[model samples]
Target: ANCSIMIDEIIHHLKRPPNPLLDPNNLNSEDMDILMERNLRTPNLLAFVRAVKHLENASAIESILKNLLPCLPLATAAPTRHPIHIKDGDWNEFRRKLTFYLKTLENAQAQQ
Candidate 1:
């Protein structure tokens, strides 16, 4: 459906780059420490947390993302006003990453 595709694109837009310097999937203690530090500094991550805070319910994730579409800096302007796209599974994975990062942030805060 159109909504699903739109969700996918928004999710894709927020993805962190998989550069050789950091492997998000295979994060060690140092990587986690780095991520925690970066999480506080990264604009996209801040926006993501803001979006999550604005979310009224899990079922409304798509709607919340649509609201954030215009805020994302896309490669082209064409998709700025249009709906983005995403699959249910992909959304779940995105949620998982967000949760993990938030947990990492919380742990760091507790230590400080």
Candidate 2:
């Protein structure tokens, strides 16, 4: 449970990126381009790939399910069954959430 929560926090951090325009020192057309790129789709795709790799390497199915539950848009209710198999839509949702989490972590780190 603790490990799952830790991973959840890490996932959350990956969803939000820092605001680059707020810094006067970094103001420029190039900086603007960088900020736009940071706010775009590339990082999210990278994060999704990393998350998939992590899930495969850990073989911790339970942990992945727990971490993903809250992020699922259609998983508002608790499940009543064990050894549940995720549908294709659910899997896609997980990828989307993973991407969001990755962007957040990247943004926060950039700010620091």
Candidate 3:
């Protein structure tokens, strides 16, 4: 088909080789953080590292769970939302409000 375009034609036509040079990581690093979390720029990095087989707790799952449990920061700012609620009922209140608004839909089959 005539619509089948080749690489060189597509390249010289536009100034930048979009397909080839789109993601120069330095410029796109911010966007990449959102896109991939970069796999390399990890969050629970040391947490998982300590949980590695070489240096782990005795129990199978406990190995990972050991450091991983406290891996995430939990403070006034970073609130934990489980039972024995460290924080207030704000989390549950927010959940209720979210579901309240969310249910104000028709299972979304309204129109064409």
**What local distance difference test score does each model get?**
0.38, 0.36, 0.25
Q: What is the lDDT of residue 25 in candidate 3?
A: 20
Q: Can you write out model 1's per-residue Cα lDDT over 1-112, one digit (the tens) per residue?
A: 2423443454444544444432232333443343344333133343444445443343354444435334333223231121111123233334445444444433443354
Backbone clash pairs for candidate 3 read: none
lDDT of 3 at 28: 25
The residue pairs found clashing in candidate 2 are 13-104, 13-105, 14-101, 14-104, 14-105, 15-100, 15-101, 15-104, 16-104, 17-107
Candidate 2 lDDT, tens digit per residue, 29-85? 332232234233233333334444444332343344345434322222422222211
**Which candidate's lDDT is highest?**
1
TM-score on alpha carbons, each prediction: 0.29, 0.22, 0.17
User: Model 2: C-alpha RMSD to truth?
Assistant: 15.0
Model 2 lDDT, residue 90, Cα: 27
True-vs-predicted CA distance for residue 101, candidate 3, Å: 25
Residues 22-105 of candidate 3: C-alpha lDDT, one tens digit per residue:
222221223223212222212322322332333222234223324333322322333222211111212222122212211222
Ranking by TM-score: 1, 2, 3
Off by over 4 Å in 1: 1-35, 38-42, 47-90
